[PDB]
Design a protein around this ligand. Structure first.
Ligand SMILES: CN1C(=O)[C@H](Cc2ccccc2)N(C)C(=O)[C@@H]2[C@H]1CCN2Cc1cc(Cl)cc(Cl)c1
Lengths: 119, 119
């Protein structure tokens, strides 16, 4: 039924023990990556439809940590998680609902989602 | 333990010990209220710009629990210095909009809604 969520920094949003923050500033992919890292975090990593099911409600497009495909940490993209759609020619990806990755020019300013997990 | 948030239902968002859930199937205010109650919750109650500073990130408009008979569902009145109340329509129910706006609208109009729980 109920549970606690964490551990997370207190100004981060907690969902199924992952910590998220949304940034409304539009930045290119590298600036966004650096922004998350400066907060002991990374860009959004999509690893579970079940544990990240609220990603189905995302409004708009946001940078996630997927680059040309693998994640920031060097982990590969798991196969049955994202439908990858070409939007602009590019080497980075935007997350958008529902479980889509939209290929985007890495220089294009976009909002972004940061994520932390303490397993 | 300061790093944990809750208690909340396992599939709800937690922020500063409040639990939130977003519903994107549009309902009128009364049906939105009943939907939140069916999950042991209420519609969004806005009581603090700091404790609920995540509400600056909300995209689109959503039913909250403020109704003019201005009272929240729990019977408390709206506190000052929380929301900019705007009346573009005649209406008796309020939609939340970022940043800390409440739009007075017709209760019968279908809208998305935000539910909230706090133990
Ligand atoms: C309408 N909406 C919003 O306004 C939110 C920003 C927000 C989030 C929570 C509370 C206040 C504001 N953003 C901008 C979205 O894109 C969506 C939806 C809700 C859900 N979220 C996406 C989402 C996905 C996961 Cl896995 C975890 C979280 Cl915490 C959020």
């Amino acid at each position: 039924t109920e549970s606690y969520c964490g551990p997370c920094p207190k100004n981060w949003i907690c969902y199924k023990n992952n910590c998220y923050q949304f940034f409304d500033e539009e930045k290119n992919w590298y600036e966004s990556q650096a922004s998350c890292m400066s907060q002991n975090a990374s860009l959004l990593k999509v690893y579970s439809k079940e544990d990240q099911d609220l990603l189905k409600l995302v409004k708009s497009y946001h940078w996630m940590g997927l680059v040309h495909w693998q994640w920031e940490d060097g982990s590969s993209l798991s196969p049955n998680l994202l439908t990858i759609i070409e939007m602009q020619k590019g080497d980075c990806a935007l997350y958008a609902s529902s479980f889509k990755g939209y290929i985007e020019n890495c220089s294009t300013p976009n909002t972004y989602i940061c994520m932390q997990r303490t397993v």
